[PDB]
Amino acid sequence: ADVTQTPRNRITKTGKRIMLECSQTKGHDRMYWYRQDPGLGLRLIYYSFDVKDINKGEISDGYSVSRQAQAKFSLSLESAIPNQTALYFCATSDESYGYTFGSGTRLTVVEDLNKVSPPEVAVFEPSEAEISHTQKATLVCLATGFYPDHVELSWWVNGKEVHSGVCTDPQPLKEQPALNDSRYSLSSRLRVSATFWQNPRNHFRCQVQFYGLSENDEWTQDRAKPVTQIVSAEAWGRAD
Amino acid sequence: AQSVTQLGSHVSVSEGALVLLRCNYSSSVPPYLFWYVQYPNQGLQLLLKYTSAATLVKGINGFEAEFKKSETSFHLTKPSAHMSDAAEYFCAVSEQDDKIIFGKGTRLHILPNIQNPDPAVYQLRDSKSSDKSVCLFTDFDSQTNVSQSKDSDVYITDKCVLDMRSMDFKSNSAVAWSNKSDFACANAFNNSIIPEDTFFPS
Incomplete structure (x- = not known):
């Protein structure tokens, strides 16, 4: 169908019951919930062929499901734990293995919400030596001090998103790798011609969408409540 | 099975x-x-x-x-x-x-395919008026790879390939940074095997 999943992103504390919902419009008998983890592919949690028909997959422990309508298949984390952090995918199938996947739910389970922290973001301007040597100019964005690892980084030139000339690290690194709740860092590069960097009209912005707490979450610290938010840093082109 | x-x-x-x-x-x-x-x-x-x-x-x-x-x-x-x-x-x-x-x-x-490599280590400064910088190792070919840091206060990213469509030009790079007084870009990549002709500007 249009297979749709709700929510798209969620952060939760450990020990809570969490529900993910899959809905379809084509009314296929067969519905599935999978989780994706790096190096493991997609592993089946549970599947259903009709209302009140439920079958375990390979990794059903810690989960339950309900098929409350032809159109709907719900997945529950019964009591969330950190190793349930994953990208979750619903799917439907026809009778001939024609699968349709939902677009995914990115779920992060953290032990202690007090550790949640938005990134600090900085832009580092191109080297004069790069400019002179190559006639190109590399900007670097650095996002630091964030937790959990649940961000999206993009670049914006004169107000419009760019993909050309960009490379963002595929995974953040741990700032204190010996710690189970270490904060994270992420870098990205945007490379332009030297001519384009040298125009003082041109505006460059690194944007980090961070996913953290909601309005509903309690917050007892003096520091800013680490809600879902955007943090950016910017630089203008420079002739000198 | x-x-x-x-x-x-x-x-x-x-x-x-x-x-x-x-x-x-x-x-x-x-x-x-x-x-x-x-x-x-x-x-x-x-x-x-x-x-x-x-x-x-x-x-x-x-x-x-x-x-x-x-x-x-x-x-x-x-x-x-x-x-x-x-x-x-x-x-x-x-x-x-x-x-x-x-x-x-x-x-x-x-x-x-990097036909004319131009390996180099550049220092980049924060756009805001901090005394902060990072180091950028760039423009090396396929035979170079970047090692993880040996010092817990020095951070080094994996190599990343960017494709600049404007000039039909691809390049590799890795970024390094540190919060230390000790830290110079000349030494940032000392645990990596870098090209013998890597450019280190003054």
């Missing part, structure tokens, strides 16, 4: 060279087989499938796969590796007449 096996979590191909991603299966009766692609930051897209019709199956973008029962294989090929082929690829198989089971995935890394 029905399963599906992909060989290597991460694999490399030279830009322009034959793409070959392997898949084997263990079903006694031939199964249906599927190849999916997941481009960075997105969901799953079906490239092609074997559904007991043609054994040479063609997919979108010049991808093809031949079902070979005698070697229980279904290898995905494409004639020429392009930078846009960088993604994760999953082989999958029908199981128990009721589901598709997935392989563990292989990420394809495309090594750009």
